[PDB]
Amino acid sequence: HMASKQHAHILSLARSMIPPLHPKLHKGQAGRIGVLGGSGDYSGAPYFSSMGAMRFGADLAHVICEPSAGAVIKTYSPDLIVHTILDPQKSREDIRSALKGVMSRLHVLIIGPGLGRDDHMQSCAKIAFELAKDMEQMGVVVDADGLWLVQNEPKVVMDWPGVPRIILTPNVMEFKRLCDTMKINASGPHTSLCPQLATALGNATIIQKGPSDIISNGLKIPFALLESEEEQNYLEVKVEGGLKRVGGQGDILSGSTGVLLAWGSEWVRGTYEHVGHPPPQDKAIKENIPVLAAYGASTFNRTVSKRGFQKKGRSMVTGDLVDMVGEVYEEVFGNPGEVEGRGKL
Amino acid sequence: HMASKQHAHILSLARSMIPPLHPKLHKGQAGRIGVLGGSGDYSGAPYFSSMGAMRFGADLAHVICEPSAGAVIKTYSPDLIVHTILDPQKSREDIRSALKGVMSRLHVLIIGPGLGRDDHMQSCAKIAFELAKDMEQMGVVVDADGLWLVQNEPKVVMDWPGVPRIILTPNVMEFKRLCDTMKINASGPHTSLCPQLATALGNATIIQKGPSDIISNGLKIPFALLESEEEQNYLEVKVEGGLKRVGGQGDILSGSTGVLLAWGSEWVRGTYEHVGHPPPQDKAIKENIPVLAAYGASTFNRTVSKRGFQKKGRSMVTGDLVDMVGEVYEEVFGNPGEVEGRGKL
Ligand SMILES: Nc1ncnc2c1ncn2[C@@H]1O[C@H](COP(=O)(O)OP(=O)(O)NP(=O)(O)O)[C@@H](O)[C@H]1O
Ligand SMILES: Nc1ncnc2c1ncn2[C@@H]1O[C@H](COP(=O)(O)OP(=O)(O)NP(=O)(O)O)[C@@H](O)[C@H]1O
Ligand SMILES: [Mg+2]
Ligand SMILES: [Mg+2]
């Protein structure tokens, strides 16, 4: 009842972020997404995140990685632009300037897929956090060992200028580690842990992944989204996912999260006004693009896993899901948005 | 009305360039196409152009690139011949002679896909421009950073011997940069900019890519193609394309442009006379092979993007389009040409 209406309503708000597929748009206005990771042996995760982003709808996806992983990742798909610029044989200044060059061409950077924990790649991720901080129109999604960096240096996400534009996606153990760093007591009510952590991290948006996902930026969900009672300060996605717990499904999530974050950010900026999607009136929607991107992506990713599991069952691997992103996008966003009168979504 | 009749007529002339698939032809007479590019990290664009060329109908497609990109590009397809001869550890003379060896086996060289802007690859492209200039039966298609070289040294396309045989394919910004180099005033009428630039570049044929494509070699479109009024000096392709602005669709265009340029050039040379396609009577058609190849490829590429977008929608990537070149070729050229009595096209 209430839960179904609220879920549909918030999903509808997420759908409102999506630019129409319109003759007047040119290459790049539907999203330029970067994935920073791919160290050493970790080839699959940055592919899943970046190719997931392309199948979800990005015009361009960039992978920023080390040379060895980069050579593998390029063979998976000619549609990815793979920058092997995190070469430990390069000076730090050269890496910083190479990273700045690529990042200046991005709406959103996903930090973490296949990043690993060694000093070099962690330092490269820290550089990227620092550049993103000072690029006010840059969104950031943090996953995998990107979250290890936050756990070690939480200030990398704290006190950013501009609108809020960070989404963290910890699994159960990554979340517990984050809470321990921020001295958040685990005896708290289960649904209060995520808003506490988000608050302690300067109201970044956090997707706490699990049997259900708990989403929060630490603030109450404004009237535009969620009587005499205050609106909840978290959202819980319980939509049916898949039953096969094969590795990589969080990378589909980060890639699709990054795309929705880029679209919603460009939407609020006014980029889609000339194709009939002007920014929203309500300041609360502008301030909550990360929560809407997060809620939409969480919902979508479980639906992708559900459909992949219906097709493949016990045999499902995450590579299968990359091929199903398009049809599930059409189910969740494209066909509903078009029937809603939003244009070809 | 008039626009539909003219479009169909010019497309019919482009179709007349296509050799029949005939038992008497042997390997290579339906096109030996080269793509010069593939530097550093840029793996996808030369694949899209060269594999697009093969799916369009070339007998052999060659990629001329650096070793690192070449190793990736080879894994995409055993049908491409990848020459990793642009090795910066090789002497210039060795590169020149290696390039000359491969180019002497080509009808057409596509310069630019994944070329990049660094001194080495730009110098390799300049060598290739110089050899092509002095190989009178060699056609050239210039895209991507091949156009950066022209923008820096426009003489590389000026004063070529033989028939005109160069086609440039700038997008909106590349076109503006070219106009600035050639001191062409942007206040001019919109459809007069492309013929002015082509004229300033010695009547090379230019595809100005955009919401529609404007095609011109700077000269009026002769009576064979376009009362008391002079024929237009440009053609405009407005056929429906796709709505997904994913990167790489200009590489499908360059590969298909290169194939049509090779076929039309061999056709005028007399190569297909013994299989029932003698050269055209009209000198204007011979002088306008580049415009016909350009018009046919522009039309075809938007139709490919249209069909790929109908199948994949928001999820379309350019890799999907490579697989659809064959069926769209059959729609645009093969089945119409056969019903026209041109043989199995
Ligand atoms: N029990 C569950 N039932 C259904 N969906 C689930 C379940 N647990 C997690 N998910 C979903 O599966 C995806 C990945 O979640 P989860 O396995 O918790 O993260 P992870 O450990 O980071 N995965 P990975 O990408 O392999 O590193 C998310 O979309 C979750 O919502
Ligand atoms: N708004 C549009 N609607 C439909 N087709 C378009 C539109 N803009 C460009 N095209 C076509 O898309 C293809 C690529 O054009 P365009 O994006 O302008 O070039 P580009 O920037 O060089 N692309 P790329 O190959 O990624 O570098 C051409 O076949 C164009 O005719
Ligand atoms: Mg994970
Ligand atoms: Mg281009």
Side-chain angles (χ1 to χ4, degrees), chain A residues 3-4 6-88 91-92 94-125 127-162 164-172 174-175 177-182 184-189 191-222 224-225 228-282 284-310 312-345, chain B residues 3-4 6-88 91-92 94-125 127-162 164-172 174-175 177-182 184-189 191-222 224-225 228-282 284-310 312-345:
Chain A
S4 261
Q6 171 167 292
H7 172 66
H9 173 78
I10 293 161
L11 206 52
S12 188
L13 292 185
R15 264 199 312 281
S16 302
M17 305 187 309
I18 301 178
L21 288 154
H22 193 283
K24 288 176 175 163
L25 299 177
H26 64 249
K27 173 174 93 162
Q29 295 180 304
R32 305 159 180 272
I33 314 296
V35 170
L36 192 152
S39 72
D41 280 329
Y42 295 143
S43 65
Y47 165 77
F48 293 143
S49 179
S50 62
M51 199 68 209
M54 300 206 69
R55 288 300 192 184
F56 192 87
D59 286 335
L60 297 170
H62 298 257
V63 176
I64 303 169
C65 61
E66 297 190 326
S68 171
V72 172
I73 294 160
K74 285 168 190 177
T75 75
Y76 294 146
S77 171
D79 280 281
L80 302 175
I81 307 175
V82 178
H83 310 264
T84 52
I85 57 166
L86 305 183
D87 185 336
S91 65
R92 185 206 202 270
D94 287 340
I95 287 174
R96 190 199 176 261
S97 88
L99 199 42
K100 192 175 182 187
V102 176
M103 286 179 64
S104 81
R105 289 142 55 201
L106 305 177
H107 295 107
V108 171
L109 184 65
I110 301 162
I111 303 185
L115 180 76
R117 303 185 171 192
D118 63 52
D119 281 352
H120 163 72
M121 295 296 289
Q122 289 285 305
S123 300
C124 294
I127 298 186
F129 270 113
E130 288 167 356
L131 295 168
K133 184 188 165 165
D134 285 330
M135 278 169 196
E136 284 194 38
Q137 310 306 128
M138 163 89 47
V140 169
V141 180
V142 186
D143 193 28
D145 291 314
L147 300 166
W148 176 259
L149 172 57
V150 177
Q151 161 188 337
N152 287 330
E153 292 185 70
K155 280 179 184 183
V156 306
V157 300
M158 292 167 80
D159 302 328
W160 282 26
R165 54 204 163 97
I166 300 169
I167 299 167
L168 317 180
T169 67
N171 76 7
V172 158
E174 298 152 2
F175 184 86
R177 281 197 294 271
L178 290 176
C179 286
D180 288 339
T181 293
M182 307 310 291
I184 283 145
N185 189 328
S187 90
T191 48
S192 100
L193 290 193
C194 187
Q196 288 184 74
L197 183 63
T199 290
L201 291 177
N203 301 114
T205 292
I206 300 180
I207 310 181
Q208 179 191 7
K209 287 172 312 195
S212 64
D213 299 349
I214 293 171
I215 293 175
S216 185
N217 64 8
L219 303 171
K220 72 169 184 147
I221 304 298
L225 284 66
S228 51
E229 314 196 322
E230 182 168 87
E231 287 105 8
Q232 48 204 104
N233 64 3
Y234 71 94
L235 298 170
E236 174 161 17
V237 177
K238 291 169 177 276
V239 317
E240 174 175 13
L243 293 172
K244 170 78 176 287
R245 299 272 57 86
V246 71
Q249 297 176 70
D251 301 303
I252 307 292
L253 176 58
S254 69
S256 66
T257 301
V259 176
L260 285 166
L261 175 59
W263 287 343
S265 296
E266 285 303 291
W267 174 52
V268 167
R269 276 222 295 111
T271 308
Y272 306 137
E273 186 281 335
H274 71 299
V275 296
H277 288 198
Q281 166 78 217
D282 195 331
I285 292 165
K286 312 191 187 188
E287 300 162 23
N288 282 278
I289 296 297
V291 168
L292 293 173
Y295 194 91
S298 173
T299 297
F300 167 81
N301 200 54
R302 291 162 72 91
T303 303
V304 172
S305 295
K306 182 180 63 178
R307 299 299 189 204
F309 181 70
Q310 287 167 348
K312 302 289 178 186
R314 175 73 70 180
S315 77
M316 195 193 80
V317 308
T318 291
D320 302 327
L321 301 181
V322 175
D323 282 352
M324 303 178 68
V325 162
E327 69 189 66
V328 180
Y329 176 90
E330 177 71 5
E331 169 185 344
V332 170
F333 297 115
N335 174 71
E338 191 165 358
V339 173
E340 289 183 320
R342 296 174 193 282
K344 210 306 192 176
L345 290 200
Chain B
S4 261
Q6 171 167 292
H7 172 66
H9 173 78
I10 293 161
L11 206 52
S12 188
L13 292 185
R15 264 199 312 281
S16 302
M17 305 187 309
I18 301 178
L21 288 154
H22 193 283
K24 288 176 175 163
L25 299 177
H26 64 249
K27 173 174 93 162
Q29 295 180 304
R32 305 159 180 272
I33 314 296
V35 170
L36 192 152
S39 72
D41 280 329
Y42 295 143
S43 65
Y47 165 77
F48 293 143
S49 179
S50 62
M51 199 68 209
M54 300 206 69
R55 288 300 192 184
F56 192 87
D59 286 335
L60 297 170
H62 298 257
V63 176
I64 303 169
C65 61
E66 297 190 326
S68 171
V72 172
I73 294 160
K74 285 168 190 177
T75 75
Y76 294 146
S77 171
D79 280 281
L80 302 175
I81 307 175
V82 178
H83 310 264
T84 52
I85 57 166
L86 305 183
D87 185 336
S91 65
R92 185 206 202 270
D94 287 340
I95 287 174
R96 190 199 176 261
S97 88
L99 199 42
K100 192 175 182 187
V102 176
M103 286 179 64
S104 81
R105 289 142 55 201
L106 305 177
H107 295 107
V108 171
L109 184 65
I110 301 162
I111 303 185
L115 180 76
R117 303 185 171 192
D118 63 52
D119 281 352
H120 163 72
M121 295 296 289
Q122 289 285 305
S123 300
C124 294
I127 298 186
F129 270 113
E130 288 167 356
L131 295 168
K133 184 188 165 165
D134 285 330
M135 278 169 196
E136 284 194 38
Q137 310 306 128
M138 163 89 47
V140 169
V141 180
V142 186
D143 193 28
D145 291 314
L147 300 166
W148 176 259
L149 172 57
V150 177
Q151 161 188 337
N152 287 330
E153 292 185 70
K155 280 179 184 183
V156 306
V157 300
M158 292 167 80
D159 302 328
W160 282 26
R165 54 204 163 97
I166 300 169
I167 299 167
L168 317 180
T169 67
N171 76 7
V172 158
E174 298 152 2
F175 184 86
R177 281 197 294 271
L178 290 176
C179 286
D180 288 339
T181 293
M182 307 310 291
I184 283 145
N185 189 328
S187 90
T191 48
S192 100
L193 290 193
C194 187
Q196 288 184 74
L197 183 63
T199 290
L201 291 177
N203 301 114
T205 292
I206 300 180
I207 310 181
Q208 179 191 7
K209 287 172 312 195
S212 64
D213 299 349
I214 293 171
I215 293 175
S216 185
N217 64 8
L219 303 171
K220 72 169 184 147
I221 304 298
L225 284 66
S228 51
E229 314 196 322
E230 182 168 87
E231 287 105 8
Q232 48 204 104
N233 64 3
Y234 71 94
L235 298 170
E236 174 161 17
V237 177
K238 291 169 177 276
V239 317
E240 174 175 13
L243 293 172
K244 170 78 176 287
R245 299 272 57 86
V246 71
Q249 297 176 70
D251 301 303
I252 307 292
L253 176 58
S254 69
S256 66
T257 301
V259 176
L260 285 166
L261 175 59
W263 287 343
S265 296
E266 285 303 291
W267 174 52
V268 167
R269 276 222 295 111
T271 308
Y272 306 137
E273 186 281 335
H274 71 299
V275 296
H277 288 198
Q281 166 78 217
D282 195 331
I285 292 165
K286 312 191 187 188
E287 300 162 23
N288 282 278
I289 296 297
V291 168
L292 293 173
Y295 194 91
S298 173
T299 297
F300 167 81
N301 200 54
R302 291 162 72 91
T303 303
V304 172
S305 295
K306 182 180 63 178
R307 299 299 189 204
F309 181 70
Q310 287 167 348
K312 302 289 178 186
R314 175 73 70 180
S315 77
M316 195 193 80
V317 308
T318 291
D320 302 327
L321 301 181
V322 175
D323 282 352
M324 303 178 68
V325 162
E327 69 189 66
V328 180
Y329 176 90
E330 177 71 5
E331 169 185 344
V332 170
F333 297 115
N335 174 71
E338 191 165 358
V339 173
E340 289 183 320
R342 296 174 193 282
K344 210 306 192 176
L345 290 200

